[PDB]
């Protein structure tokens with residue numbers, strides 16, 4: 001038995017980890033209203049994506065990995081000698097990437113594919129990749145890994161804010177918000193993931209209080225966990241995520257793992273400007 005672990009590009013793992021563990025990536029892409037197509041990777045500067053999105057008369061659209069892209073990656077790993085492939089996918093509630101990796105795994109010959117629906121995104125999704133790799137090193141078998149990740153998913157989540165719901169509304173990736181649309185006010189929505197989908201949680205008066213609300217909601221949850229990893233995932237307003245990251249390092253005990261990451265182009269296209277998430281995993285994920 002020889003187990004590989006791969007993922008899609010929305011796991012947003014650092015290039016250091018991708019290089020170290022030779023993590024294969026099925027890339028998602030963004031298409032701008034001028035017809036320019038960009039596949040996600042770590043070489044394109046995220047600041048230039050936000051600049052182009054801001055200069056777009058029409059919101060850019062995104063594409064999941066084609067089923068052929070999953071198949072090609074599966075065949076490449078199989079031909080390297082891997083007998084089993086664990087695949088960590090973007091939430092099935094917001095993208096068809098998972099079901100396409102699942103169906104691609106049915107179609108590829110000569111290798112066993114174990115597709116996993118992370119029901120989240122960004123480095124929180126990436127944490128499932130890092131847990132699977134760690135377990136492969138420890139000699140666990142594919143079903144044992146899938147079982148462990150499924151348990152991990154029960155104590156994993158995220159809350160988030162965005163400047164403007166228009167991007168999420170345009171793509172249909174905000175669930176059950178046909179009420180705070182258009183109207184709202186200077187008030188700020190706080191959203192959360194729930195069974196793979198993005199739903200409203202609370203409406204607060206200011207953005208400053210929304211960021212305080214992110215921390216309170218998450219700390220209230222993880223105080224009951226035996227292990228805790230927290231991820232501040234920042235959008236285009238650098239000072240928002242850096243301030244929350246710094247504050248969490250101060251307010252939390254060192255027994256909490258507190259890490260930082262950012263949104264890539266595909267997720268940023270759906271969030272728009274001002275995205276800021278606070279995610280948690282009830283595990284001590286190996287980040288090295």
Ligand SMILES: CCCCCCCCCCCCCCCC(=O)O
Pocket residue numbers: 028062063064094095096097121122124158159160173231232233266267270271277278279280
């Ligand atoms: C702290 C963690 C926060 C995570 C927030 C992630 C927000 C995701 C918003 C929707 C993204 C949808 C991508 C769809 C890609 C496609 O299939 O075209």
